[PDB]
Design a protein around this ligand. Structure first.
Ligand SMILES: Cc1ncc(COP(=O)(O)O)c(CN[C@@H](CCC(N)=O)C(=O)O)c1O
Ligand SMILES: Cc1ncc(COP(=O)(O)O)c(CN[C@@H](CCC(N)=O)C(=O)O)c1O
Lengths: 419, 419
């Protein structure tokens, strides 16, 4: 009856996101932090939500099926069945969730017990660690590190030490979480890299959880490969996606996990007594969205195909202006984020009035308040022992109107050499 | 690497809800089961969702603030500040969630540690027990029991044994969950009943969680009273609502917890790493719905004021045809569910084809597949040892078009022998 946090949440603090969203509302900077477009998503999707709101069907805005709206799961199985080349059962092998967030939540709560080890690759999407810890698991970390220095490098250059990775696998290893395309780097794992992970999972009987929200956003000449597609991997993989990312409608918060029925049963049990069901007219609108794209999967007008081309130009413009101004950027193989090492610009920043412990927090806060440009501190994506690996970096989002990417460039040009 | 359920979820089965929704899609009965309307909700709310989908603001459909969309938390604080007669800080004292479901989830995960005792009042909304058990908590049950037999009783007649209740409270008691107006019975707790609980919560330093989802649906001459409003109770209460119940848009799945900052901090830590944030356009629409009602709170055509008379005509009709066919109905003080005793018609049913443990599951099951009319087996809402109090009963929803209520009666008559 002390109403302290229960032990499993012991020492929990507010996430980066709660802190930096609040920082954005307060200073109103050019917001290149959290990932979302600053322009309209596909009209066919927005139209479908207005249509569901306006539907003459009285069931359109009432409860739908708890493991997912029938029309959506059917659309999801149609698409992914083609992509993974097996027939995925829409009732048993798909679970619709509240964003990729709740799919990750239901997966971790579903398969992580007290003392189970979970391997996490740093830098990691930040929720992975607190979710494992809340489920009583023991995270085991391995960092990706660049094998090139100075100038602009590629996210391909950020690599695991495979001996170090092998070393982490033992009889206590329950799960490994991989994220490709990767947040924050943009790294897309190639077939050899997936093979390394898959071979260890098979040897050690571990569950692979593949966070693939950015699956449609890989840039030529690279290619998204699905690990559940590797030999023997289907039986031991759960794969996650997000309609917020697939359709660029981040405020809709609908995602999914797919995989064999045996593994999904555990997620269903968590899901059913966490939220139970997800928004009907939103899932309906997403279902129409998938139906729309399913008719044209190899067309240049298909949003799955067009987004990379849309994004690649903006990636190239930001990499250029970040290099121009003095940072060392990592050019992502997919996605809409880019990390840059800003440390060579340490003389143009006074971080003296900044209060927190981590340098990249001080840098990003200072830039927000002082110059009106918001990025995200990458040390948020590292375990405490390795936070130093992130401190010289900044993550920016380039999913923006060209006019706003130019605005960021000009802020940076003015800040630099206007000494 | 047995990927069996974790120890937290060991007992776990599919909920009444995953089972009955599936039942319902399969046999396509007159669905008097899950609580939702048969017809459309107020048009102003539906219109506001269409407007958010169609918005010129590109951020209308992108991520919003994780603890609650600002327009919505503002409208909630404006409403509840007036209802509870205090100033509720919209930023720190309101949390928006994926339905009342995730409000209960974050509350129980946030405040129940291993070994904590949680007292639950039977019959109970079904998620309470599995949530407590998932949090490592120990559920402690007490049934409401009718103090009258024969005919049509009132939900006021279902009452707790005061000494049973007092004995349940010990220094291991962390929490009590109360639900008023109550599901499935429709009981509205009077002031003395809320005083009993209040005085025990203060004595034993326990957190009261008040599930008030049906807050606006109390029938004359009864009154919804909020326990957080009793002396000394604000500091020890979390109260929960649902937009899905407030605006009869059950597929929108947005609810909230409000109470003191100290207590909501715990739910914030769970929420930030469970779903993170909720749907933007749905929260925007609900905020517009609240602003609309806030301009006319004292007027009869305010939906918070009008829904009671709308539902009361239906309540009275159902109560009357249930009694005519020879059921013993409990007339609810509030809400849109009615529980009735179907024992005195056991003769006239064949449960000999149904396979489940509980007599009332076999019944709901019979009537659905065989006579085209589904409700909910009230055993679902009892602890294993007490399920027997739920086995003579059946719960129906009367939030249905007048003509379907007239049809549902007919089905009952055609099966009983009232033609
Ligand atoms: C790798 C990865 N995995 C899961 C997710 C979550 O997807 P939802 O469908 O929105 O729940 C994300 C999205 N992360 C975005 C936004 C983070 C946030 N908390 O809003 C980002 O990193 O900026 C992500 O980037
Ligand atoms: C007492 C009570 N508390 C919470 C809730 C959940 O509210 P949301 O806002 O839809 O999450 C309910 C809803 N009860 C409904 C719905 C059952 C279900 N959807 O699992 C019922 O019992 O028929 C309820 O009846």
């Amino acid at each position: 009856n002390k109403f302290d946090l229960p032990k499993r949440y012991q020492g929990s603090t507010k996430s980066v996101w709660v802190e930096y969203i609040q920082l954005a509302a307060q200073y109103k900077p050019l917001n290149l932090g959290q990932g979302f477009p600053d322009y309209h998503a596909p009209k066919y999707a927005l139209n479908a939500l207005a249509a569901a709101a306006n539907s003459p069907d009285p069931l359109a805005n009432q409860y739908t099926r708890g493991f997912g709206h029938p029309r959506l799961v059917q659309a999801l199985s149609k698409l992914y069945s083609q992509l993974v080349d097996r027939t995925i059962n829409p009732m048993t092998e798909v679970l619709v969730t509240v964003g990729a967030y709740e799919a990750l939540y239901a997966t971790i709560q579903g398969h992580v017990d007290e003392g189970d080890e979970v391997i996490i690759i740093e830098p990691f999407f930040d929720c992975y660690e607190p979710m494992v810890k809340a489920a009583g698991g023991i995270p085991r970390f391995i960092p990706l590190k660049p094998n090139k220095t100075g100038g602009t490098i590629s996210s391909a250059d950020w690599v695991l030490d495979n001996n170090e990775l092998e070393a982490l696998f033992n009889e206590k290893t329950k799960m490994i979480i991989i994220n490709t395309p990767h947040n924050p780097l943009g790294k897309v794992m190639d077939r050899a890299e997936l093979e390394v992970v898959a071979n260890l999972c098979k040897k050690w009987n571990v569950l692979c959880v593949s966070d693939e929200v950015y699956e449609h956003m890989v840039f030529e000449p690279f290619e998204h490969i699905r690990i559940c597609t590797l030999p023997g991997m289907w039986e031991r993989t759960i794969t996650i996606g997000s309609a917020g990312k697939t359709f660029s409608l981040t405020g809709w918060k609908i995602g999914w996990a797919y995989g064999p029925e045996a593994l999904l049963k555990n997620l269903q049990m968590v899901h059913q007594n966490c939220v139970y069901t997800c928004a009907t007219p939103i899932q309906e609108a997403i279902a129409v969205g998938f139906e729309t794209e399913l008719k044209r999967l190899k067309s240049p007008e298909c949003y799955f195909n067009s987004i990379s081309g849309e994004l690649m130009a903006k990636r190239d413009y930001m990499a250029s202006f970040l290099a121009e101004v003095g940072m060392n950027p990592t050019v992502p193989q997919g996605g809409y984020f880019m990390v840059a090492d800003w440390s060579s610009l340490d003389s143009k920043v006074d971080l003296t009035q900044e209060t927190d412990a981590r340098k990249d927090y001080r840098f990003t806060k200072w830039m927000t308040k002082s110059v009106g440009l918001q990025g995200i501190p990458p040390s948020a994506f590292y375990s405490e022992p390795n936070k130093h690996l992130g401190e010289d970096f900044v993550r920016y989002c380039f999913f923006k109107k060209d006019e706003n990417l130019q605005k960021a460039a000009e802020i940076l040009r003015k800040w630099k050499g206007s000494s």
